[PDB]
Design a protein around this nucleic acid. Structure first.
Lengths: 46, 271
RNA sequence: AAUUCCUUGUCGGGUAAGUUCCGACCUGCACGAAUGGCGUAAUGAUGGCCAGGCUGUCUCCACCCGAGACUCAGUGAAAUUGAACUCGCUGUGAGAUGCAGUGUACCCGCGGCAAGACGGAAAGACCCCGUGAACCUUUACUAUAGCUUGACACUGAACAU
RNA sequence: GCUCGCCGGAAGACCAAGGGUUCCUGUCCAACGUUAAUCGGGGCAGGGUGAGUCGACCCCUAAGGCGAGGCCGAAAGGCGUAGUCGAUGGGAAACAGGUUAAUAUUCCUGUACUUGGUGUUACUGCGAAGGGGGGACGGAGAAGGCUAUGUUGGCCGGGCGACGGUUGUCCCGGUUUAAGCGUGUAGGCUGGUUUUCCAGGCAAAUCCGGAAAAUCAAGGCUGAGGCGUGAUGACGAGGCACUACGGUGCUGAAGCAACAAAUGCCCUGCUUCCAGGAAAAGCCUCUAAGCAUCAGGUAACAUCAAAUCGUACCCCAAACCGACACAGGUGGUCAGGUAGAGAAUACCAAGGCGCUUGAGAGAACUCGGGUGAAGGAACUAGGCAAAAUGGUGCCGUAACUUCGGGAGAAGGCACGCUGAUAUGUAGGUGAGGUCCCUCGCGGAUGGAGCUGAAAUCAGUCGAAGAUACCAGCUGGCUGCAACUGUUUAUUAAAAACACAGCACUGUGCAAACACGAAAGUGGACGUAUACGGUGUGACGCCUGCCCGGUGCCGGAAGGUUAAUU
RNA sequence: AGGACCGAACCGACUAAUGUUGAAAAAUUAGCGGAUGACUUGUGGCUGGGGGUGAAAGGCCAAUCAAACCGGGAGAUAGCU
């Protein structure tokens, strides 16, 4: 049975990568919220 | 020519084909070709703006000359070609100076016939002249609506318009729809009728034939649920309301023309 | 009749016997002509019905080959669980292992069966209730996008009546 | 280690995606492994991934994203031009052998190739963000010529048989060799060459396109494979000195032919059809602005450079997605033998495995199967399930029909093996020899050798010859839908949804309509034989009556009627 | 020639049994349908919540759909347990 998660590094970065988050105001707010929370891993870049 | 396919299997019993042997059996003129990417009926927002559009065979656009501004240059027809972007056929014309262009095919234009555009051009099918010079009552096609804009009327498979009267700067025309419209006499027009009369006689014969054209299936609307269409659902087949479009418009006689911008060039709507 | 309530309508065919099926009849509860009517070859993992072949489907089960079940060694769950020294019957309190009377019964496992413990599982979905929701409908109410009408503004010039 | 069993269009081999050390060696057995564990994809330590040619990066672009200005929008922001990004596509070059416990087209040996920089020499019109060519493109079908590959023979080496025979028509194994370079064949495409002229290719042009003459027919391009060379080499069954029986030096025979043959190659070809089949760059040419005893361009030689990153291992699975060492899911490539139409199926080769609890017993009952007296649907809501039919060839085949079908209708007969026809035929393949020549990978004749059906006749074995696996039950009446398709992922596959066809209606293009506060976009680079919406639903015969209601489309006399005044 | 025929791969999911604290939060086994097309598949892209998409089932939109998910208004309100 095919499951929901079909990994793809290229699609992973384009959808949730660091540059993608910086591309929009709302995405930049996501990083700001995560930085305020002190997240060790800001995004899924690596 | 119209030929009926033999009923060797379902899906071919009712297939009627329009075979034209005169059409070129080869690749078109590459220089006058352009990329034509499909849209699926979706605009720049990505939303379906026109339904029932999608799929179909890949097509390459042909640069058809709808202006015919090469005044005073005799041209000779090289061959007739099949155009996937339009119902009518197109003809490859070679001008006396070595330039090749694509034009709509009139009723009786073949390889070797000569055509010419301009005020002094002869009154023969395929020739383009301003409607001021064209005698009243003759049948024309590819009519221009504005001076120099390019042909915009009677471009279909076998359509044509006729000049009914010359009142001065404007010429009244009887369009295929029956509309009596007037345009400036300076507008250009092509003599004759676009020749594909048999185009309306074809029978697709099967569902797949429509899909080849890029026409996706149409869901009626009475077969949907109320959340989807005004015709909605019901237990069985009820349909107890006035017919409407999606989004709630009568679409059973209700006139939707509200332009009012020109509303002066129109003499009689139709019928 | 995918439509017929009365109804298994009536007659005929098929069967020893046919509420189904097929063919007619018309008394169409409550068919009907593009929310189509009546036909229709072909097609269908489609509905109904009848035959030949075929058989453990059955009369009526028998034997056999394997995997479990069973025993030994190793590892090692689960739902459930107020507490239990946790029997039958009749009666009682509204269908009793637990009350009354009476009968029966040495203590404890293992393999089986599933009648009861109103067995386990899911704060019944049916039903009603709440001045509870949610979507949906419309000639319910009140609004509103859109469409449409006119006035004024953007907006002037002469001429004639 | 010897047997046995299982897969073998994989349960083998090589990758992408993804994972990220699971790879190799040593060591340890608490935990992890559904048991034990000396073992492990477990713990610990060490080791391991070598590139001008593979891939990425890089050059080029598709869908699409972003977007200087710009247009639009309360703000946020939206769309989009010039541009710039974006592979799943296009663009230069490496093959064979050997080698490590673990890497190799990356290292080593041998033999090659590509694109650039600099310099020398000779000959020289060079030059672009421009022009043209090219790149460059569909589906189906059809053969023909080939190769991969396989079979047999020949050759070489070895063998003479645990039990009758086996020195022969016997048995086992091997018989392998690339890129590159040269040759330019089967076959495909195209008529060349020279001069003159021209409203075209945003300006120019010797290039492209077009026009008019002259002159010859042989010019050119593309092109699998074969052959030669690469190769006096490498590899090589097996031997000989070493030989911790763990393995290395040296040596190492034959290394040919015939036939069959692909879904691969010629083929981005050919034929044919309608639904009419990417873009851009590299590359080849054209000149402009400009530079000209320069600079640049062409060829040869020499020299230098080709960086950086990935490279282990798994990759139909115990390493990826499923919480698991989970009967699930996961794209590409490779495609042996016998039988067979076949990538089905059976049995096997190479290779890989026996699926991480076993040992006994041989109860009920459950699960998966085999067989069955007599009867044969009496079962049951229902022939559910099971049983049965099953192949090829020939004969034969109804109603009905849209004349295609129905149809493999139904039904019947023959199938093994041996021999002969014919010591292996018809057919296919085709050597030597002879003849011809513009003598060449040539043509004709020629038929050796090899390969090889099918049929007839006769004989013969069994209960049974399409013997296994594999492999249609058939027929009659009838409802519904024409049909192929589509649908409730995870209880509904249907008579529902689509459908071709039909009709009504809207829409004259800045179209109707749709998404958008707007710009704008789709509709459409379309134009009434078009497009949107609605209903109906192939086809055949037809589709009657009613406009009071509601809606829609017109109408003008009057009545009523908003802001405003 | 064919939304032609028989039939593997491939894509489907009609019947039955098993399983139902399953090997599996939909699978296995034996049959079954399509299998040159309205086919199927890899990679990437686009459409966003009263919205998308939908050969239409209220289907699907990350095991969730008559209005997804996450955070917030928020300790919504609960004449009810």
């Amino acid at each position: 049975m095919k499951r929901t998660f079909q990994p793809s590094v290229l699609k992973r970065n384009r959808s949730h990568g660091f540059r993608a988050r910086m591309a929009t105001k709302n995405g930049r707010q996501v990083l700001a919220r995560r930085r305020a929370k002190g997240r060790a891993r800001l995004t899924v870049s690596k | 020519a119209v030929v009926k396919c033999k009923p060797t299997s379902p899906g071919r019993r009712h297939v009627v084909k329009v075979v034209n042997p005169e059409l070129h059996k080869g690749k078109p003129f590459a220089p006058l070709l352009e990329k034509n990417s499909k849209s699926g009926g979706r605009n720049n927002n990505g939303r379906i703006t026109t339904r029932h559009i999608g799929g179909g065979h890949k097509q390459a656009y042909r640069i058809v000359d709808f202006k015919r501004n090469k005044d005073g240059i005799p041209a000779v027809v090289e061959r007739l070609e099949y155009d996937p972007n339009r119902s009518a056929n197109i003809a490859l014309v070679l001008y006396k100076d070595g330039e090749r262009r694509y034009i709509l095919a009139p009723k009786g234009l073949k390889a070797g016939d000569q055509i010419q555009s301009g005020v002094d051009a002869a009154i023969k099918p395929g020739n383009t002249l301003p409607m001021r010079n064209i005698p009243v009552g003759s049948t024309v096609h590819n009519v221009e609506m504005k001076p120099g804009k390019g042909g915009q009327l009677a471009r279909s498979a076998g359509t044509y318009v006729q000049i009914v009267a010359r009142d001065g700067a404007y010429v009244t025309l009887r369009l295929r729809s029956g509309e009596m419209r007037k345009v400036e006499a300076d507008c250009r027009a092509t003599l004759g009728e676009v020749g594909n009369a048999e185009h309306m006689l074809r029978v697709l014969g099967k569902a797949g034939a429509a899909r080849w054209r890029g026409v996706r299936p149409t869901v009626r609307g009475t077969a949907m649920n109320p959340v989807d269409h005004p015709h909605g659902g019901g237990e069985g087949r009820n349909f107890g309301k006035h017919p409407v479009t999606p989004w709630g418009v009568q679409t059973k006689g209700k006139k939707t023309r509200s332009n009012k911008r020109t509303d002066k060039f129109i003499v009689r709507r139709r019928s």
